[PDB]
Amino acid sequence: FHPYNTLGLATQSAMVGLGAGVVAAAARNSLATGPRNILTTFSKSGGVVTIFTGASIAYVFTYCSAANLRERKDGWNHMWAGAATGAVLGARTKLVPAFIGWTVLCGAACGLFGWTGARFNADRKASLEQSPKGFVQEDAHQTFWEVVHRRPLSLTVEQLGEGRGINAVPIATATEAP
């Protein structure tokens, strides 16, 4: 993990959000009914440019900040970023229950997105179709998609921890008399 540059990445996000909001404003101006001039596009925008810009800032800044602070990259950062984005979008309601609902539910949806890999298409190399599968050979380490008939007991002790039935030695062997 080497850090994201939160400031520069966030500035890039600001630019892109402003551009996207401008485009959405132009489309909104062309699709609507009633009289419309070239300056009314922002007048009758619905604040759409602000929607785009604020969402961009919130998501990118929070994501980079959380990633740098935890020194990890995983779905939790996207959960935080979605929480902040939902906070921005739910501020428009001007009601505290709705603000909270947007916060938690957008955060949960984006955490779900980040947990699946934070992509809409697939990571082809990691997928089961492009991976070692089936039963492993003689004494190889088990990888994510591979299956064995017996795992090493040391691995079980490491992963589960000792206690509540997980032991480094089977009981009957250990309690044998001589």
Next chain:
Amino acid sequence: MMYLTYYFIEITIFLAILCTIFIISAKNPMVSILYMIALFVIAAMYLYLIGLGIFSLLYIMIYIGAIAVLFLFIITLLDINSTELSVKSNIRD
């Protein structure tokens, strides 16, 4: 010669831009059809310049001689309403 004849392709391009704008801005849709015919003559000019005079003649034979004729025939027989280009209607785009 050389100065004009070197930029014949560029002149066809400029004329094509102008002809398309005139197609879209025409008050009478029959005038729009005529500007479409003009654009097709310009396309035939370009095709001759790049060595395809046979396609120039084919385009004149088929798109002007047949398709534009059908266009005019239809607009003559049919009752078409059209509005004019204006700021009130089109500056919003």
